[PDB]
Amino acid sequence: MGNDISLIALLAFSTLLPFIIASGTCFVKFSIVFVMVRNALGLQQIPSNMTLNGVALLLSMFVMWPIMHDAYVYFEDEDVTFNDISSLSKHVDEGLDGYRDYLIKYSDRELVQFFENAQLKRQYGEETETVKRDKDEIEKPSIFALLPAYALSEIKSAFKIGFYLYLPFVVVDLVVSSVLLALGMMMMSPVTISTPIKLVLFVALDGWTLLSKGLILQYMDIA
Amino acid sequence: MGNDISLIALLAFSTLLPFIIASGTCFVKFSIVFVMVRNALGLQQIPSNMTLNGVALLLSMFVMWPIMHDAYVYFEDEDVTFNDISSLSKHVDEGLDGYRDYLIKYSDRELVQFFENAQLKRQYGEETETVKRDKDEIEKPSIFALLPAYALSEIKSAFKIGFYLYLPFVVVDLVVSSVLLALGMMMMSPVTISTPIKLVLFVALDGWTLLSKGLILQYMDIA
Amino acid sequence: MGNDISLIALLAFSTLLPFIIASGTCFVKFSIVFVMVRNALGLQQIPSNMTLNGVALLLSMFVMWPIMHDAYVYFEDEDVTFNDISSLSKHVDEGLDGYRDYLIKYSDRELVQFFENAQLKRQYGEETETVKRDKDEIEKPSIFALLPAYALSEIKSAFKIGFYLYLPFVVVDLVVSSVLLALGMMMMSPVTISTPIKLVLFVALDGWTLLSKGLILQYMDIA
Amino acid sequence: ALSEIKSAFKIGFYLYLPFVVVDLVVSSVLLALGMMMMSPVTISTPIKLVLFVALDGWTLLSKGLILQYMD
Amino acid sequence: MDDLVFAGNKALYLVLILSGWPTIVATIIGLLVGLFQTVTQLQEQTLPFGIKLLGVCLCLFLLSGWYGEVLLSYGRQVIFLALAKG
Amino acid sequence: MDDLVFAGNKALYLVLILSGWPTIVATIIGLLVGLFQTVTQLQEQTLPFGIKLLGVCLCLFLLSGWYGEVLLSYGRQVIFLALAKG
Amino acid sequence: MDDLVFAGNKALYLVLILSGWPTIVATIIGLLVGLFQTVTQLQEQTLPFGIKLLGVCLCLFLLSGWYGEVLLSYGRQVIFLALA
Amino acid sequence: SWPFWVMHALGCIIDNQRGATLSSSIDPANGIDTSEMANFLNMFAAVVYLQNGGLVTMVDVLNKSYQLCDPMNECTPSLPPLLTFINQVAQNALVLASPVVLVLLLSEVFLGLLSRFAPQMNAFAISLTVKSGIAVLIMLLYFSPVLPDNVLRLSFQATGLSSWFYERG
Ligand SMILES: CCCCCCCCCCCC[N+](C)(C)[O-]
Ligand SMILES: CCCCCCCCCCCC[N+](C)(C)[O-]
Ligand SMILES: CCCCCCCCCCCC[N+](C)(C)[O-]
Ligand SMILES: CCCCCCCCCCCC[N+](C)(C)[O-]
Ligand SMILES: CCCCCCCCCCCC[N+](C)(C)[O-]
Ligand SMILES: CCCCCCCCCCCC[N+](C)(C)[O-]
Ligand SMILES: CCCCCCCCCCCC[N+](C)(C)[O-]
């Protein structure tokens, strides 16, 4: 209810919701990390993707809720009615700053700036140069620039984590082969012995608790 | 006629049902253990994933169906009366305690408490946690806090179990290899010999039956 | 709207948009390149297709937007009203040239001409030409001739890029397999070890940044 | 309804048997060469296609399916 | 019924016949080269592969025709058994 | 079907000659390095593999241009046959 | 297509080099221990396996810094060739 | 389903013993891995089951399930036998496959013992050439009983409904 166009906007947003969650939210990172852990342990079907994605979605909800609540309360407020296009548009813009400021901590400055340079109207000569002050440039780059830079930087940071997770298992896999060769049993496949060792190591390390905690700690602050 | 919101709640619930089952029910454990044992015997696609998932599903219902039926019997109860949104909320929450108790039984208190903090503490200007005496909050962790803490504990239990099942097969592999060497009948791959032996031995001892009983006796008495 | 037929045409175009985007835009290229990257890294499930496609669509938006805007600003002028069929037809035709240019820049004329001569029934569809004579064929060619040529011309380009992207990883695979043979560990599958090396290699190159930038730079130019 | 399902399945069974032969043969000759890492499907797919085309399957089949309903 | 049993049996019979000759020659070449390498002591291991590739390809050339005649006749037979009922 | 006969036979002949050259080189090197270990009465696993790798890489550096000529020729030819009827 | 040809030739060259050294170290260790078995003769199969493992591990531990730089240079070069 | 899963298991065991680990067969509908032999025997069992008229017994056991236990009486499957079910299915397949496994083992150890006299002979590579021929040859002799050995002895029958289910209301 209210302005007919505000209603249209609400319904459009709620229609695009899953693509936003899939492309501009920490869900991107958690989804990748859990699957990489499964591959590092060497399991092809355990757990199901339907279990891993469920966990990842729940964990993401905690991180994202406070922003959605703050933006909702900000718009469910009768304070004002607006005289003009410039007043309304700047009131709208000031509501998204919480999200804009979430994206800014994690996207990378140089890629963000390159995308902002990309949007400007073309010129016949190369574009007229500019430098702009921080309250736009640092504080307020446009969201249609921030969003893909975020997605890309997140993917990268995810691969990085997966790399570290692989290292100890690689160590195991080598050592076990070298010991079997020292015993001369050259023909036996070492996978049959290395796999359970890997599982033992992961449960004694309690890898799930550590991963689930530290991933949240990267975004929340808890005391 | 009925109430138009309780109708929405019914239809919504029935769409989410398979994801709840897949992420917050003992199905999580049963479906994992079987597939692990199947890999350890070294002959994939016997039994079929259809057989395994079918059995795991059936067994999960003995554990969970009484709890759902108890909840519906709690709600179909013509003697209640209410006065306010609070008095209704309390009674609806009270209806879910039967499920809440099951999740509390099978999950870690400290990981639950961690997520219980993480839902809020991004709000908080303070470090003190005593500010509510435990007796309420220890009983009433939220269900969204319980769910991922339960799933992450079920997986770990599954790995713990499967670890101990791998050991005897490993032993059998070492024995076969050592015999081939002691006979000098060197240039034969041992897997061709030992996979028949593992299969015949486990079937001749009804490993699957003992396994099924040992799994159910954590959750029910069969008698 | 001031004309019922203008309204009909506008709605029809709005209904066909996704097939035009999927068949006459750089999206064709960007969509393919990312999936080839994922294959060359040897990952099955991750990232999700809708994550990759989401990024591809965002990037293509920057490239195509200038044309859409030019055409909108051109068409919204009611500055002239039309005496006759030919005057209207020419007014419309001259509006598409901003698009027609972009297609003709990247397709390959020998196809375009081949199709032109084919949709006309001319001289029984194909006949020899003694003389070769070029007739400002750039302005003659119908969009219905240009579209397929563009599609094929750009798919091929994508395959080329994917070819180049595979080579570095192939090197890694053959190197790992050779040093394992040097150690004599003949039983062990390289994929357990070669994968993390690929991950760290791509992370150190920062392939997403270079790749995304270069793709845009093929169409635009930026300081 | 169940009678037609029965007979259609029955007809469909017969048609597999040549392609089944093709597949098991190809797999045996590859193992005879030791190329255990070759996926047979790549080689066996075109042999199936050319077999069916040489039979002219769709002619025979569409003829017989109609003649079953009229004398 | 008996038509079903007959056709299924014949399928296995044809597999056996067609595959038999290549596997025979790959066996004989394997034995001869293995013996030769004991008669003169040489520890190569690709030589069997190098020879038996030529051995198998040659008999695929020779039998290329009979292979197609057998499979055509079988396909026609089973299509008749399937459709010609009255 | 002289066209299907031709394309089918040529595919196998091409497999045989494209693959033969690397395996011949590898086998001859294998034999000579196996001999040298006998006349020296000195033994290790790795020397033959090490030399074989170099031998095959040189074989590919040399011949590979011709591999491209042969494959392009066959690639065109089969397409023209497939679309020959019209 | 000079660029494509170059990229291809370079690939093989890189494989031949980057695999070369470890096989040489393993060869030399295996040969030297082998000859050392002929004097004071005791004949044991596993000593080559025990010692060559140390050889190759130590070689990779020293040179692994080099490898990454060569690979990086190649990857950049091909990415540019492709996107130009 | 019970008669079909046994023949499918049998086919998987044979295709594993003869090598053939990288089998080609395709099946997306059930989501189960499949091999050429498994697919063949799984089809063949189905056609002989249908030709023996079993399709009547399927609707018979459906109707009996409603007469013997009713939706309104909270009919429920018995637990104790369900706990045996997987092991019975495995057992029947092994008992049926056993004749081919033993002969394929003896054929390999015979080449192993032969290799003692000619240690350069690659007995493994020889066995790969032999075993698929031996496997088909032997399966071709014991083939005809595969008709009756499934059509009756493994088919479920309506009298069994008494034990697998009970009414809890
Ligand atoms: C199989 C799921 C559908 C039917 C619901 C079964 C509910 C569990 C009943 C278990 C009764 C066990 N018993 C007799 C020992 O109490
Ligand atoms: C590695 C080769 C596997 C070949 C399996 C198929 C054998 C039949 C080939 C077709 C008939 C013979 N020929 C010469 C026309 O190819
Ligand atoms: C893999 C089975 C052996 C290869 C032959 C497969 C049948 C190909 C079609 C045969 C056609 C015979 N022809 C040319 C006379 O029609
Ligand atoms: C390179 C291995 C696969 C080659 C397959 C060639 C299929 C040829 C099919 C026709 C065979 C029968 N023929 C020659 C009479 O037509
Ligand atoms: C490291 C192995 C790489 C094998 C693939 C190399 C790329 C294909 C060869 C491209 C050049 C072909 N040639 C020599 C005809 O130009
Ligand atoms: C061990 C590498 C195996 C590669 C097999 C393909 C070899 C022929 C095609 C690549 C030729 C590369 N070359 C020589 C042009 O640089
Ligand atoms: C063959 C075993 C050793 C392979 C080492 C290859 C490392 C490639 C990744 C280089 C990364 C360089 N970096 C980022 C650590 O400086």
Query: What's the rounded Cα separation, in Å, for the pair H5 and A139?
Result: 65
| Angstrom distance (rounded) from CA B30 to CA B210 | 14
- Resolution in angstroms comes to 3.3
Instruction: State the Cα–Cα distance between residues B186 and H110, nearest whole angstrom.
Output: 13
Q: Give me F65's structure tokens.
A: 């241009």
Q: How far is the CA of A6 from the centre of ligand 2 (A)?
A: 69
Comparing CA positions, the residue from H135, H6, H101 lying closest to residue B199 is: H101
The backbone torsions φ and ψ at residue A25, rounded to the nearest 5 degrees and listed phi first, read -150, 155
* Cα C140 versus chain centre, distance: 23
Nearest Cα to Cα of residue H43 among H155, H100, H35: H35
Residue H166, beta-bridge partner list: H76
Fill in the amino acid letter for C177.
S
Strand residues in A112-198 grouped as ranges (E): none
Task: Report the SS3 class of residue A28.
Answer: helix
Sign of CA dihedral E46, E50, E51, E53: positive
SS3 content of chain B, % helix, strand, coil (to 5): 75, 0, 25
Question: Do F30 and E44 make contact, defined as CB atoms within 8 angstroms?
Answer: yes
Helix (H) or strand (E) holding A37: helix A27-41
Residue E15 and residue C133: Cα distance in Å, rounded?
A: 63
User: If residue H75 lies in a helix (H) or strand (E), which one and from where to where?
Assistant: strand H75-77
Cβ contact A46:A199 at 8 Å: no
Both tokens assigned to A74:
């900000």
Number of helices followed by number of strands (H, E) in chain H: 7, 2
For the CA of D25, the nearest atom of ligand 3 = 1
Greatest Cα-to-Cα distance within chain B, rounded to the nearest angstrom? 87
Q: Could you write out the DSSP letters of every residue in C51-112?
A: HHHHHHHHHHHHHHHHHHHHHHHHHT------SSHHHHHHHHHHHHHHHHHHHHHHS-HHHH
DSSP state of A76: S
Euclidean distance between CA atoms F51 and C111, whole angstroms:
51
Cα angle, residue B13 at apex, residues B7 and B18 outer, rounded to 5°? 150
Query: b/e string for C129-164 if b means 16 or more Cβ within 10 A?
Result: eeeeeeeeeeeebeeebbbebbbebbeebbeebbeb
Q: Which residues contact E17 (CB under 8 A, 6 or more apart)?
A: E70
Structure tokens at A9: 């906007």
Residues H75 and H167 sit within 8 Å (Cβ to Cβ): yes
- Experimental technique, in short, is cryo-EM
First to last CA, chain D: 22
- For residue C63, CA distances in Å to A45, C176, D40 come to 41, 41, 44
Separation between Cα atoms, residue H155 and residue A166, nearest integer Å: 50
The C-alpha of E38 sits at a distance from chain F's nearest C-alpha, in angstroms, of 13
Residues pairing with H165 in the sheet: H77
Closest CA to F48 of F37, F57, F60: F37
* Residue H156: Cβ-neighbour burial (10 angstroms; 0-12, 13-18, 19+): middle
Share of chain A residues as helix, strand and coil, in percent rounded to the nearest 5: 75, 0, 25
Q: How many CB atoms lie within 10 A of CB A111?
A: 21
Q: Find out whether A6 and A28 touch, Cβ atoms under 8 Å.
A: no
CB contact under 8 A, G53 and A178: yes
Going from the C-alpha of A198 to that of each of A52, A159, G12, the distances in angstroms are: 20, 21, 35
Q: Which ligand is nearest to the CA of B67?
A: 1
Chain B residue numbers with beta carbons less than 8 Å from the beta carbon of H119 are 187
Q: Which residue out of B65, B70, B217 has the highest number of ligand 1 atoms within 8 Å of its CB and is therefore the one to mutate?
A: B65
| Category of D34 on φ-ψ map: left (φ > 0), alpha (ψ -120 to 50) or beta | left
Our CA-based measurement puts residue E40 at a distance from the nearest CA of chain H, in whole angstroms, of 11
Q: Inspect the interface and report whether the beta carbons of G68 and C204 lie closer than 8 Å.
A: yes
CA-to-CA distance for A198 and B163, rounded, in angstroms?
Answer: 10
Rounded Cα distance, E41 and H128, in Å: 24
- 3-class SS of residue H167: strand
Phi, psi of A140 (to 5 degrees): -145, 50
Dihedral over alpha carbons C112, C118, C121, C123 (to 10 degrees): 90
- Tell if the CB–CB gap between F50 and G35 is shorter than 8 Å: no
H87, B203 in Cβ contact below 8 A? Answer: yes
Q: H63-72: long-range contacts at Cβ-Cβ below 8 A with a sequence spacing of 24 or more?
A: H64/H158, H64/H161, H65/H161, H65/H165, H68/H161, H68/H162, H68/H165, H69/H161, H69/H165, H69/H166, H69/H167, H70/H167, H72/H169
State the Cα–Cα distance between residues C23 and C26, nearest whole angstrom.
9
Peptide bond into G22 cis (omega under 30): no
> What is the rounded distance in angstroms from the CA atom of residue A75 to the CA atom of residue A78?
8
Burial tier of F54 (Cβ tally within 10 Å: 0-12, 13-18, 19+): middle
